[PDB]
């Protein structure tokens, strides 16, 4: 039970150091976009990101303590949420654009290339604008991303459940500590904690819509998905 022994500053350090790299897409500027090719780009990217996510998740305090079955379930539940919160974070300093990768920065008009996707781009963009409005900090971002991992699938599972909730509570202590050290007042600290966690409601929604969309694209043979993506997708159905 070593996750439980960490201080708040050690929690932050572990999470910052666990951060996966920002990967490049296979975007080829020599050819124009199609629905099929944009969906190919985004899913090829996500598939590579997923590998780095599995390794990140193992570095999230407490996660390694869970059984393999428990780890599968949590990741199967939250993977698209985790991809999405990263995207919104990466896009913060690019108003009106989604930075999927440094070589793949798309506006809503480029989103229109794929049927049904622009509605999701709008949600992701609105959420990135919330992040910018709040002045969301990287240390706060890593806490939220970890809470998603541990929380989204947590009720859809008994002593490991208690253990998850202990870790989740430690991430809360960590968030508050970060806010106190940044000089937020006691009242500002609880008001911001709430604002930040309400984000996760929106991230969940966007994930659910995204999963339906991706499934739609699979079922109409728009793009071939890697076996890993096929399995991650099949978990939600």
């Amino acid at each position: 039970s070593l996750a439980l022994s960490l201080t708040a500053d050690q929690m932050v350090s572990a999470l910052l150091d666990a951060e996966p790299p920002i990967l490049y897409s296979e975007y080829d500027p020599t050819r124009p976009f199609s629905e099929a090719s944009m969906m190919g780009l985004l899913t090829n990217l996500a598939d590579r990101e997923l590998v780095h996510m599995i390794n990140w998740a193992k570095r999230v305090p407490g996660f390694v303590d869970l059984t393999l079955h428990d780890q599968v379930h949590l990741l199967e539940c939250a993977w698209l949420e985790i991809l999405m919160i990263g995207l919104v974070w990466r896009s913060m300093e690019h108003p009106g654009k989604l930075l999927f990768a440094p070589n793949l920065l798309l506006d809503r008009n480029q989103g229109k290339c794929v049927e049904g996707m622009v509605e999701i781009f709008d949600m992701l963009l609105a959420t990135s604008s919330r992040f910018r409005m709040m002045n969301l900090q990287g240390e706060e971002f890593v806490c939220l991303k970890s809470i998603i991992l541990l929380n989204s699938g947590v009720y859809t599972f008994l002593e490991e459940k208690d253990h998850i909730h202990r870790v989740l509570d430690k991430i809360t202590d960590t968030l508050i500590h970060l806010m106190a050290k940044a000089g937020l007042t006691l009242q500002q600290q609880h008001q911001r904690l709430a604002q930040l966690l309400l984000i996760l409601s929106h991230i969940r929604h966007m994930s659910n819509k995204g999963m339906e969309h991706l499934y739609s694209m699979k079922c109409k043979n728009v793009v071939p998905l890697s076996d890993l993506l096929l399995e991650m997708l099949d978990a939600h159905r």
């Binding site: 590998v51 599995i54 390794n55 193992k58 393999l68 780890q71 599968v72 990741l75 199967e76 076996d227 890993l228 399995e231 991650m232």
Partner: peptide, 10 residues
């Protein structure tokens, strides 16, 4: 299956 394998490899 694949996710399960990847979680052991690292």
């Amino acid at each position: 299956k694949i996710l399960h394998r990847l979680l052991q490899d690292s």
